[PDB]
Amino acid sequence: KGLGKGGAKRHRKVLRDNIQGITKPAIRRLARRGGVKRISGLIYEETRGVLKVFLENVIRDAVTYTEHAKRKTVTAMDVVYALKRQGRTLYGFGG
Amino acid sequence: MTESLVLSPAPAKPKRVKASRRSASHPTYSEMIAAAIRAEKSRGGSSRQSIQKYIKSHYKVGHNADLQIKLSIRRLLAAGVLKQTKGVGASGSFRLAKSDKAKRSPGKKKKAVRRSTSPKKAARPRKARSPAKKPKATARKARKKSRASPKKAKKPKTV
Amino acid sequence: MTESLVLSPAPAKPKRVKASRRSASHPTYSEMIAAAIRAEKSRGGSSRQSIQKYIKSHYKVGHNADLQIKLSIRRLLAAGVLKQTKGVGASGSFRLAKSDKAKRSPGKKKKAVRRSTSPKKAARPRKARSPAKKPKATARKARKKSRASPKKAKKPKTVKAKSRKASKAKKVKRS
Amino acid sequence: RPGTVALREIRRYQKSTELLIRKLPFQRLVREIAQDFKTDLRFQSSAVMALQEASEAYLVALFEDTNLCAIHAKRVTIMPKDIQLARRIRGERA
Amino acid sequence: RKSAPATGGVKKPHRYRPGTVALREIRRYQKSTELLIRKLPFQRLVREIAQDFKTDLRFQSSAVMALQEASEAYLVALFEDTNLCAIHAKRVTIMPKDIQLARRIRGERA
């Protein structure tokens, strides 16, 4: 095995899809999309918490419109309505 | 009232040695740093410890003067008396606007040497060669002191 | 000029009677002004003729002094030690910054003497006017060597010291 | 050499028109949040992309605000202080 | 407690030091409700601006009070955010660097 480039296999785990929710590169690219040069490191934990709050609020509104429509399907129109109600008002696709 | 009440320790502890003695004058808590920072050997200025050792001599009290040194230096800075260059490696920056050097000058400034390795290098290849034995820089005073100029070694020899 | 044609044949003659570390000699050109100002006692500073007369003592740069002294004085003003007083009755101040500055000090003057570097000069008017016994100054070691801690500044001359070493009460009694 | 290609990343990412967060982890992420509020929620292809685009643009807008916080404090990095201040000043935190 | 502006004395280390009266003022001004800025000079400001916007326009006491009260609250809320911008740097003084950052983060000027 060894620390470095092992003979058989290396670098990662096999179990997946039950404890996920971490994307380290993506936060860097979004930070660069913000025009930054350095990220100060300890922002992945905060951004994940910041991300979760943002999706929690919109999904709560989105699931609220879904319940009114009497269906189990979450559509783009309801998502747009949730964003529009709170002021985000993503134009996007609505037709 | 600071010149009548908290000054009263001055006619007690400075009364002993610090006065207008005709044999030898002494400062009056306003002309102390001059003797320290003009009869000076440093290249970038004096430091806190340096001025401390310079100004403790008999008459200096130091009961609370460690504060008054900083307070008076800041008062003189506000009044516009001293001029300083920033530094971190040097423990201090206290100086005066001297007439020898212009206010405008480049950062680079000269060099220096110590020659302390020369006595040791008088024996280091002397080890490689034949005559290597007990120290012989300036005879027995080489063992006594390990550093002596020609005259400074001559004078005890003739005396 | 520092090592140019002006001072290429010059240095031969200084080797005779120039500033020698043995005893005292003619002060260097950079320090004659400071020595003259220290010798002067005027509260308002030295005038032009006062400075000229004070540095006239023995060999000097008097041949080209008329421009050299003024150029040097302007060079030192461009830095800042020489502080000046305003007026016309006095030809000039040319004061050396020696005591605490930036304070008003309204009409305050007292009999003053210093300790840092004055004693070597101050031992000279003692020779000039009235002889000595050594109850003043800081011993012969002060003028013999500058870099001396009080131990070797005192001990070569008198073996009799304060309670730190031996007992100076006998010498104090004998005056 | 450190930080050199960061400027290069600015040129590419600001004229690219794509999403940076991995889509599959986001697909499972919306299900987890929605499931707790109510059970048996079916999503749509447009719903996932619409939700992801708003979240990514919000982060980009937030990161730009934190960028001005770094230069304010004579800094080049985004410490967690920048994000906390930006959320309060913008009023999104409360 | 003696002040004595005269020559005698080198002042005191603690003579209502910069910010201590502010620490007194923050308690007093956060303990009561009132209009802080001047009323009549603000009234002339509202009238002068509206005069250029519209040649003839009358005013009532309720209208001008609402504008002044909202403006004072808007300024106070801005100061709270601007002071939060000030605490980002190791300083306790509000500076134009902070007001630019605070406004840009919000919808104003951006």
Side-chain angles (χ1 to χ4, degrees):
Chain A
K1 288 159 192 166
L3 185 59
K5 294 83 191 193
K9 273 204 177 163
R10 202 258 204 199
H11 172 170
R12 264 284 262 173
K13 313 97 212 157
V14 277
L15 269 76
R16 200 61 49 211
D17 216 9
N18 294 132
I19 39 184
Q20 288 314 83
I22 320 192
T23 72
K24 182 141 168 171
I27 307 177
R28 273 204 193 186
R29 316 191 279 246
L30 291 151
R32 302 303 165 74
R33 201 152 156 200
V36 85
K37 176 173 203 52
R38 299 220 310 146
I39 38 156
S40 93
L42 71 171
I43 59 159
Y44 306 103
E45 275 76 0
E46 204 188 14
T47 40
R48 288 196 300 275
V50 164
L51 267 156
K52 189 173 194 292
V53 175
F54 180 84
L55 330 181
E56 273 184 357
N57 293 333
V58 293
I59 286 166
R60 275 179 196 173
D61 292 353
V63 86
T64 319
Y65 292 117
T66 303
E67 186 194 55
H68 192 73
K70 305 178 191 180
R71 44 160 160 100
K72 307 180 184 184
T73 311
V74 179
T75 41
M77 268 212 270
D78 285 34
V79 170
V80 167
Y81 296 155
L83 300 156
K84 166 194 272 271
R85 173 241 169 183
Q86 64 177 46
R88 176 53 58 125
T89 199
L90 159 57
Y91 288 153
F93 33 92
Chain B
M1 161 31 72
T2 73
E3 310 195 299
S4 288
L5 181 143
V6 46
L7 158 79
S8 53
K13 324 220 157 185
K15 177 259 164 172
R16 309 156 187 178
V17 191
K18 214 199 295 156
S20 154
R21 293 186 164 197
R22 299 293 154 157
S23 304
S25 46
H26 311 271
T28 63
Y29 266 28
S30 43
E31 327 158 297
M32 326 196 63
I33 36 167
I37 84 184
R38 323 170 161 190
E40 182 204 90
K41 192 195 293 317
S42 87
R43 45 149 169 117
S46 205
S47 73
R48 194 158 289 86
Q49 336 303 359
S50 78
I51 65 187
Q52 278 166 7
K53 38 186 62 69
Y54 286 149
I55 72 194
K56 303 142 180 73
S57 156
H58 307 330
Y59 45 82
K60 179 76 174 184
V61 188
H63 66 308
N64 270 344
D66 49 355
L67 298 168
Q68 321 293 32
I69 290 151
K70 266 212 173 204
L71 186 47
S72 100
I73 220 76
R74 291 193 202 191
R75 144 75 205 165
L76 294 183
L77 258 282
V81 191
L82 320 196
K83 147 275 181 193
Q84 311 203 354
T85 83
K86 192 61 211 185
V88 200
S91 157
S93 177
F94 309 98
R95 307 188 312 264
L96 298 126
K98 249 186 62 67
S99 69
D100 180 50
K101 300 318 287 169
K103 34 170 187 174
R104 334 178 158 208
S105 48
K108 316 138 71 62
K109 194 173 190 304
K110 310 310 147 288
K111 215 171 176 183
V113 85
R114 306 230 199 281
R115 303 211 287 229
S116 69
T117 85
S118 268
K120 231 78 172 187
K121 187 172 62 73
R124 175 64 171 80
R126 202 216 57 180
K127 154 215 167 206
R129 65 192 51 150
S130 307
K133 82 210 193 302
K134 294 186 51 49
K136 286 187 28 194
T138 172
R140 293 215 145 270
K141 214 168 183 66
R143 304 71 171 270
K144 296 285 188 62
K145 181 55 203 81
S146 65
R147 205 210 167 287
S149 323
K151 238 218 177 165
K152 294 332 290 183
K154 165 33 151 53
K155 165 147 178 140
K157 281 178 182 174
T158 166
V159 152
Chain C
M1 162 294 288
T2 38
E3 202 45 45
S4 310
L5 313 95
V6 67
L7 210 184
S8 162
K13 314 93 177 193
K15 317 282 172 262
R16 324 261 170 101
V17 76
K18 212 63 177 295
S20 306
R21 308 223 269 285
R22 184 183 317 297
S23 191
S25 296
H26 313 150
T28 51
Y29 153 40
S30 304
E31 286 219 278
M32 41 205 298
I33 299 311
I37 301 322
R38 283 174 174 188
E40 187 134 353
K41 304 91 170 163
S42 177
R43 79 173 211 281
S46 55
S47 36
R48 202 142 301 100
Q49 303 304 50
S50 321
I51 303 193
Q52 262 67 84
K53 147 211 187 74
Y54 277 27
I55 45 191
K56 186 175 173 195
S57 54
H58 299 32
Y59 154 71
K60 68 171 307 310
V61 200
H63 27 62
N64 216 20
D66 52 345
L67 54 90
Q68 282 204 36
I69 309 302
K70 187 148 187 182
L71 262 62
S72 62
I73 220 75
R74 297 207 155 286
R75 164 63 264 165
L76 318 173
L77 310 183
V81 164
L82 306 160
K83 33 175 274 282
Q84 311 258 340
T85 326
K86 208 61 48 162
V88 62
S91 312
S93 156
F94 305 110
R95 278 173 314 169
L96 248 63
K98 270 293 185 283
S99 197
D100 43 358
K101 325 188 258 174
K103 276 197 172 201
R104 297 315 301 250
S105 56
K108 304 212 191 153
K109 52 149 194 52
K110 302 191 89 159
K111 324 282 201 183
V113 80
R114 304 151 51 270
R115 169 85 93 76
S116 94
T117 323
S118 34
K120 54 162 301 203
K121 333 276 204 179
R124 296 322 205 81
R126 204 160 60 202
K127 169 64 168 176
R129 341 150 186 185
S130 294
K133 145 63 161 193
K134 181 33 171 75
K136 325 327 150 192
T138 41
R140 210 88 181 273
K141 259 284 185 174
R143 84 161 91 201
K144 276 184 170 195
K145 219 215 174 178
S146 43
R147 185 70 214 278
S149 325
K151 204 43 161 73
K152 330 152 285 313
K154 154 275 174 181
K155 65 83 181 173
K157 254 306 187 188
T158 166
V159 83
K160 174 152 301 313
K162 285 282 281 313
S163 188
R164 283 305 99 179
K165 24 192 180 315
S167 174
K168 194 201 283 179
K170 305 301 138 63
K171 200 52 151 195
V172 152
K173 269 204 75 178
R174 255 159 280 288
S175 152
Chain D
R1 186 70 170 172
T4 325
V5 307
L7 324 171
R8 156 171 90 164
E9 278 182 57
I10 318 291
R11 321 199 196 286
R12 158 200 282 173
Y13 289 146
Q14 293 216 293
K15 64 179 167 166
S16 43
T17 75
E18 75 306 11
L19 295 133
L20 299 167
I21 304 173
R22 310 196 263 184
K23 111 182 187 173
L24 202 35
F26 190 80
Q27 181 166 21
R28 89 142 197 73
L29 178 50
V30 294
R31 308 264 198 74
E32 168 184 317
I33 301 181
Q35 179 125 352
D36 200 2
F37 309 140
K38 277 228 158 63
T39 60
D40 194 359
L41 282 156
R42 192 167 300 207
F43 280 68
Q44 236 167 47
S45 83
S46 285
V48 180
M49 311 314 317
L51 196 43
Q52 190 179 337
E53 182 65 25
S55 178
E56 280 207 358
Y58 156 67
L59 260 68
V60 173
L62 191 42
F63 271 123
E64 185 177 3
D65 284 348
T66 64
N67 197 322
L68 296 201
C69 287
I71 186 169
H72 179 277
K74 305 181 190 176
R75 259 198 333 259
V76 200
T77 86
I78 319 317
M79 305 266 288
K81 271 162 122 187
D82 305 349
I83 298 169
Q84 294 297 269
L85 261 70
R87 276 176 66 81
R88 142 81 188 264
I89 299 157
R90 210 148 79 170
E92 322 210 358
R93 213 215 279 188
Chain E
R1 287 230 190 180
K2 245 73 181 173
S3 153
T7 279
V10 300
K11 314 205 305 312
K12 298 142 280 288
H14 222 89
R15 74 294 178 270
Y16 283 134
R17 296 179 73 253
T20 53
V21 161
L23 295 170
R24 172 194 281 185
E25 250 189 297
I26 57 160
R27 296 178 202 205
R28 293 193 55 204
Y29 262 127
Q30 286 174 9
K31 200 192 148 183
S32 47
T33 176
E34 40 175 335
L35 290 153
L36 303 203
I37 61 173
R38 305 301 299 153
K39 304 160 199 63
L40 183 51
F42 193 85
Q43 195 273 335
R44 301 205 228 116
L45 175 52
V46 177
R47 184 178 292 277
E48 179 183 313
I49 286 183
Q51 208 80 26
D52 227 347
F53 278 28
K54 222 143 165 302
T55 296
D56 291 344
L57 180 61
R58 286 264 194 94
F59 285 83
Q60 61 182 218
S61 71
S62 293
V64 290
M65 282 313 222
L67 294 165
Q68 181 180 341
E69 192 150 50
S71 297
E72 291 190 29
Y74 171 79
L75 286 175
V76 163
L78 177 57
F79 278 131
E80 293 182 343
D81 293 352
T82 323
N83 193 54
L84 257 298
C85 286
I87 208 176
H88 211 38
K90 293 92 159 203
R91 68 161 167 249
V92 303
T93 317
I94 175 187
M95 233 161 258
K97 325 181 202 172
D98 321 83
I99 193 157
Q100 297 166 277
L101 165 66
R103 286 188 68 82
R104 170 113 206 261
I105 281 168
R106 297 137 74 151
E108 315 144 19
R109 292 189 192 274

